[PDB]
Ligand binder design. Structure first.
Ligand SMILES: Nc1ncnc2c1ncn2[C@@H]1O[C@H](C[C@@H](N)CC[C@H](N)C(=O)O)[C@@H](O)[C@H]1O
Ligand SMILES: [K+]
Length: 568
DNA sequence: TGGGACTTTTTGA
DNA sequence: TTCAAAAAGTCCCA
């Protein structure tokens, strides 16, 4: 039988909106096989022939049908031993099917049609007496009053972020799941909590979820809950690899238990090449045991609020830098997010747009995107922002409102602050403070494959795809902008930032203040030469005609100085 | 269809 | 009053 045929057809029958609204995305066979084998390979069926295995978001049964197959083999291979040890009339091969359905397999899901599909599949596992009772619940698993705990829990919970959940349901989650769910958290945090809570003492859970909670600020409470309530046996981190075809998400597999053990050591498997096609191989285990993955151990007792999951060389490197640097960016700098207009099409125009003849130049600001940020310098802006907060009233600037911004008035009126009357329909939603942008400052893209910190000399504005900071006045005599972009753009600081950065998709990390401002910095005898090399690079890059190859050589020299400074 | 360039505004606090 | 986080990303193309 093909346990993945009907579920795949059902998933293909749905549209994008319904799948996103319920997280209806099913797990490929190679992942299911690994997780089921991980949980059930060494189960002692003679000691415990009544194992309770749960998928609380079972869908059409990608996990539970495989659980059925493994359990059938487990019972069948030991049928005469069970017969001798226990009721000899109960333990026959012809009874295994019934037993598995009555006592061992449990599923829950909000989706009534998927439950119906799974019920038919489990029934069709045996050509069939009485009607066998199957333990499938059509319910919201986060609200169900669960009547008992489970020996094994496996699956793939729905992933739904703070924009796609409804506010009423989010009120429920904020009230009832506050130990792991606050602010910009995700629904799968709540599923982690529920799974941990209904796992028996000595039970084992194994799930594939997004990887982002391993590093995200929103995941802090969830990480604390996990490390305080279960022993984490294993983390498989796929980084930016594409595990779910046609899905823009990055994955990890957590296996944990509630066993009374003095172990506290976690096996960490981290992929090396993000470009591998996982499904091209027979099993995940063979990939984990090859040169395609790196393995190392982490002492669970040494985890802080942050989980730094790196090998010994990277740990030594990170610790050297942390110990050597007496300052962080947060100590010496003021950080801020870019403008949020709330409807960019209304306020952002190409600088050559004829409509800008209608707008007085005192309202216009230079506007850049993340792609305009290079190491050390920003591209020339191609766009202009109408800083519409400076429009006093409607009458005096009628054309601007009628012929440019008003084209999106309906959309503009749907913004939260306009509906509440806090913002006029033509104003920017979060216009911040002009004075913060209209000064020398450092700017960096919010998502990038590498450190790209640039000095802005042109009072550029940007949306939230670009973050900025300026150096506090009291630290200007200890750190200049040129020195800071020198060390921040170095190979050393790229590796150092990525030790703890939030890995988003293939070749993309978040560069957000909650981690960028934690970067630590130093000043020593190499300060002057590092700064001079940075100035040389900057001067080359701003030259209209100069070829930039020498920049690389200058950078190599700078990296060497930085390594000497940090003893690495 | 799979891979690469690129990134809005809604939202809780 | 007003901050900053959040990829079951978006979107285009060979
Ligand atoms: N509140 C909920 N309670 C229970 N199930 C839910 C809830 N919300 C969504 N679901 C289901 O969660 C499932 C998540 C899917 N990724 C299916 C996972 C399934 N275990 C599989 O790996 O194939 C979807 O089928 C949803 O219908
Ligand atoms: K017996």
């Amino acid at each position: 039988q093909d346990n993945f045929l009907l579920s795949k057809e059902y998933e293909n029958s749905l549209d994008v909106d319904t799948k996103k609204a319920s997280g209806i995305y099913y797990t490929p066979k190679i992942i299911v096989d690994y997780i089921v084998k991980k949980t059930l390979k060494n189960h002692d069926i003679i000691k415990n022939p009544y194992p309770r295995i749960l998928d609380i978001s079972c869908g059409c049964g990608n996990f539970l049908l495989e659980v059925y197959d493994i359990l059938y083999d487990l019972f069948e291979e030991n049928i005469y031993e069970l017969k001798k040890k226990y009721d000899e009339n109960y333990w026959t091969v012809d009874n295994i099917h019934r037993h598995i359905l009555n006592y061992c397999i449990y599923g829950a899901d909000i989706d009534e049609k998927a439950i119906s599909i799974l019920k038919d599949s489990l029934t069709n596992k045996k050509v069939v007496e009485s009607d066998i009772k199957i333990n499938l619940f059509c319910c919201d698993s986060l609200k169900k009053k669960w009547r008992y705990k489970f020996d094994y829990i496996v699956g793939n919970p729905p992933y739904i972020g703070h924009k796609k959940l409804e506010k009423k349901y989010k009120k429920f989650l904020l009230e009832k799941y506050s130990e792991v769910y606050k602010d910009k958290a995700d629904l799968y945090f709540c599923f982690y909590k529920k799974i941990i809570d209904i796992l028996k003492q000595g039970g084992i859970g194994s799930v594939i979820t997004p990887r982002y909670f391993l590093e995200s600020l929103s995941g802090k409470d969830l990480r604390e809950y996990i490390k305080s309530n279960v022993n984490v046996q294993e983390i498989v981190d796929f980084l930016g690899a594409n595990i779910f075809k046609n899905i823009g998400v990055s994955s990890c597999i957590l296996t944990f238990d509630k066993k009374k053990t003095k172990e506290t050591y976690i096996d960490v498997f981290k992929i090396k090449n993000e470009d591998i096609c996982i499904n091209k191989f027979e099993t995940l285990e063979e990939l984990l045991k090859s040169s395609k993955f790196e393995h190392f151990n982490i002492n669970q007792r040494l985890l802080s609020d942050e989980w730094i999951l790196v090998n010994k060389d990277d740990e030594t490197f990170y610790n050297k830098i942390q110990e050597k640097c007496k300052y962080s960016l947060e100590d010496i700098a003021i950080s801020f997010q870019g403008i949020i207009t709330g409807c960019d099409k209304a306020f952002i125009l190409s600088k050559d747009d004829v409509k800008l003849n209608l707008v007085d130049d005192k309202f216009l600001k230079c506007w850049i995107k993340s792609k305009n940020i290079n190491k050390y310098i920003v591209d020339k802006s191609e766009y202009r922002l109408i800083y519409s907060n400076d429009i006093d009233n409607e009458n005096t600037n009628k054309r601007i409102l009628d012929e440019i911004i008003g084209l999106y008035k309906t959309k503009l009126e749907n913004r939260r602050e306009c509906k509440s009357g806090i913002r006029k329909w033509y104003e920017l939603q979060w216009g911040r403070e002009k004075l913060f942008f209209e000064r020398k400052k450092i700017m960096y893209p919010y998502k990038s494959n590498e450190n790209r910190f640039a000095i802005d000399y042109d009072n550029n504005f940007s949306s939230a795809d670009v973050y900025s900071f300026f150096i506090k006045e009291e630290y200007l005599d200890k750190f200049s902008y040129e020195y800071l972009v020198g060390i921040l753009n170095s190979s050393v600081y790229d590796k150092y930032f990525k030790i703890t950065a939030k890995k988003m998709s293939k070749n993309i990390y978040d560069y957000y203040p909650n981690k960028v401002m934690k970067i630590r910095i130093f000043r020593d005898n190499n300060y002057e030469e590092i700064e001079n090399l940075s100035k040389q690079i900057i001067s080359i890059l701003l030259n209209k005609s100069i070829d930039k190859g020498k920049v690389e050589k200058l950078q190599i020299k700078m990296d060497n100085l930085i390594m000497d400074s940090l003893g690495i």
